[PDB]
């Protein structure tokens, strides 16, 4: 049963369904990686999705903020427990007295919703939305899926250590990380691998950035990079502290069903039944407030389990998932936003054949 035949079975019906354009599939195995590519990377040229196409990943990007701000943590600039306004003294009297750091990360703070309000569109007005908010839940007792809650996370860590959150990123993470075709904006020079996205309108579009673009869902990457970035994520980095950054990010604060939230990355027990991946990655959890099962410690979360994110974007699709115990990692990145359930079924059959 050769990994090609199990990868195209799995990917054809999405190409079927979706009328995907383009999508680059990587999979690590044994200390290799093996990459399968479908389509085209824009409609209108000539080149063919590679393994070295970029992609928005969306929320993907999200674990790279995670690992920034796990960072921030070695390098001192702040503790996950600390309150949030400890770091942003513009938030004092605010809910941001009473939520920590790790609450933003794991979308907790209290409410914070999915995106921005769309009035909310310069550094000033997000200050005072921030300043403002209400909260609907007290802190820690719900989590709710928020770019404005994780995007405030990498926004202060970068703070702490007195560097812009891109700075950080494009100087010092994803160097130390060896990412060279991995970005918050991509370079003129790699204009030439950037996929264009296919909204549900069959529209080509591509990200125009927001406030905490960067933060919440600003990572374009090839699946070469990404799944590079997966492998330092099971067998390590060869920088000291960007492997303590990384580990750090296995550690988790809650369950939410058969998932753990950790900073970033959702985590599942592995052996894990495809039912309760599709749970945990379906709006019930996604587009609900869910009431927390809370950890009287946060925990670091271990091997013999099954690490994912999703992300999406108009006009592109992603999903990672990878299992640190046997060595095996999937990057699946497409040009249309297709639905995640889909993405997730395709992912675990390929997984139980390279993991059975």
Same mark, same amino acid.
């Given at each position: 049963?050769?990994?090609?035949?199990?990868?195209?079975?799995?990917?054809?019906?999405?190409?079927?369904?979706?009328?995907?354009?383009?999508?680059?599939?990587?999979?690590?195995?044994?200390?290799?990686?093996?990459?399968?590519? $479908?389509? !085209?990377?824009?409609?209108? #040229?000539?080149?063919?999705?590679?393994?070295?196409?970029? +992609?928005?990943?969306?929320?993907?990007?999200?674990?790279?903020?995670?690992?920034?701000?796990?960072?921030?943590? !070695?390098?001192?600039? *702040?503790?996950?427990?600390?309150?949030?306004?400890?770091?942003?003294?513009?938030?004092?009297?605010?809910?941001?007295?009473?939520?920590?750091?790790?609450?933003?990360?794991?979308?907790?703070?209290?409410?914070?919703?999915?995106? +921005?309000?769309?009035?909310?569109?310069?550094?000033?007005?997000?200050?005072? $939305?921030?300043?403002?908010?209400?909260?609907?839940?007290?802190?820690?007792?719900?989590?709710?899926?928020?770019?404005? #809650?994780?995007?405030? *996370?990498?926004?202060?860590?970068?703070?702490?250590?007195? =560097?812009?959150?891109?700075?950080?990123?494009?100087?010092?993470?994803?160097?130390?990380?060896?990412?060279?075709?991995?970005?918050?904006?991509?370079?003129?020079?790699?204009?030439? /691998? $950037?996929?264009?996205?296919?909204?549900?309108?069959?529209?080509?579009?591509?990200?125009?950035?927001?406030?905490?673009? /960067?933060?919440?869902?600003?990572?374009?990457?090839?699946?070469?990079?990404?799944?590079?970035?997966?492998?330092?994520?099971?067998?390590? #980095?060869?920088?000291?502290?960007?492997? =303590?950054?990384l580990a750090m990010t296995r550690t988790g604060?809650? #369950?939410?069903?058969?998932?753990?939230?950790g900073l970033?990355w959702?985590s599942?027990?592995?052996?894990?039944?495809?039912?309760?991946?599709?749970?945990?990655?379906?709006?019930?959890?996604? *587009?609900?407030?869910?009431? !927390?099962?809370? +950890?009287?410690?946060?925990?670091v979360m271990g091997?013999?389990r099954?690490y994912?994110?999703?992300?999406?974007?108009?006009?592109?699709?992603? $999903?990672?998932? *990878?299992?640190?115990?046997?060595?095996?990692?999937?990057?699946?990145?497409?040009?249309?936003?297709?639905?995640?359930?889909?993405?997730?079924?395709?992912?675990?059959?390929?997984?139980?054949?390279?993991?059975?």
């Amino acid at each position: 049963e050769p990994m090609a035949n199990i990868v195209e079975k799995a990917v054809q019906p999405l190409l079927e369904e979706y009328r995907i354009p383009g999508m680059a599939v990587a999979v690590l195995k044994e200390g290799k990686p093996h990459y399968f590519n $479908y389509g !085209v990377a824009n409609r209108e #040229s000539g080149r063919r999705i590679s393994e070295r196409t970029l +992609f928005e990943i969306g929320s993907v990007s999200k674990t790279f903020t995670a690992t920034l701000g796990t960072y921030a943590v !070695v390098k001192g600039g *702040f503790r996950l427990d600390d309150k949030v306004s400890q770091h942003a003294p513009w938030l004092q009297n605010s809910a941001f007295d009473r939520v920590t750091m790790a609450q933003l990360a794991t979308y907790s703070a209290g409410g914070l919703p999915l995106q +921005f309000p769309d009035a909310v569109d310069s550094n000033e007005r997000m200050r005072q $939305y921030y300043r403002q908010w209400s909260p609907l839940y007290a802190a820690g007792t719900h989590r709710e899926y928020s770019n404005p #809650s994780i995007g405030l *996370f990498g926004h202060l860590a970068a703070s702490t250590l007195g =560097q812009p959150f891109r700075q950080l990123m494009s100087q010092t993470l994803l160097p130390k990380l060896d990412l060279q075709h991995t970005y918050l904006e991509v370079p003129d020079a790699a204009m030439v /691998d $950037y996929a264009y996205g296919y909204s549900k309108e069959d529209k080509p579009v591509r990200v125009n950035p927001g406030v905490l673009a /960067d933060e919440a869902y600003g990572i374009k990457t090839s699946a070469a990079d990404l799944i590079k970035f997966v492998g330092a994520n099971m067998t390590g #980095s060869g920088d000291k502290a960007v492997q =303590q950054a990384l580990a750090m990010t296995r550690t988790g604060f809650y #369950s939410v069903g058969e998932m753990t939230q950790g900073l970033g990355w959702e985590s599942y027990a592995y052996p894990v039944t495809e039912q309760a991946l599709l749970a945990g990655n379906s709006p019930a959890v996604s *587009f609900k407030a869910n009431p !927390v099962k809370p +950890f009287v410690a946060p925990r670091v979360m271990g091997n013999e389990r099954l690490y994912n994110k999703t992300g999406s974007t108009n006009g592109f699709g992603a $999903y990672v998932v *990878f299992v640190p115990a046997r060595g095996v990692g999937i990057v699946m990145l497409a040009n249309r936003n297709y639905p995640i359930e889909a993405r997730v079924k395709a992912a675990y059959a390929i997984m139980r054949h390279l993991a059975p």
